[PDB]
Amino acid sequence: MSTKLYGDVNDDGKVNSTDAVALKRYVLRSGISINTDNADLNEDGRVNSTDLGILKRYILKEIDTLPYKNG
Ligand SMILES: [Ca+2]
Ligand SMILES: [Ca+2]
């Protein structure tokens, strides 16, 4: 029907400061349940700090493609 997300945490929109709640709970331990499927995209898990940026960069609105920018 319709799909638009990128490594969502609570399947709300995406994994960012918004889904930090679970993040903190995650970074701490792997107890909570999140769409770990496509959650991590830098072998970090979520947004250690390197991904966050881009995330908070694209998640700003670009949320749809995400300028991963390889390099
Ligand atoms: Ca979300
Ligand atoms: Ca990551």
Curated annotation (Swiss-Prot):
Entry binding sites for Ca(2+) 1: 8, 10, 12-14, 19
Domain Dockerin: 2-68
Binding site for Ca(2+) 2: 40-41, 46, 51
Location of this chain's protein in the cell: Secreted
Residue stretches in coiled coil: none
Amino acids binding Ca(2+) 3: 40, 42, 44, 46, 51
S-S pairs: none
UniProt family annotation: Belongs to the glycosyl hydrolase 48 (cellulase L) family.
Function field: This enzyme catalyzes the exohydrolysis of 1,4-beta-glucosidic linkages in cellulose with a preference for amorphous or crystalline cellulose over carboxymethyl cellulose.
Name of the protein described by the UniProt record: Cellulose 1,4-beta-cellobiosidase (reducing end) CelS
Full-length numbering of the shown residues: 672 to 741 of 741
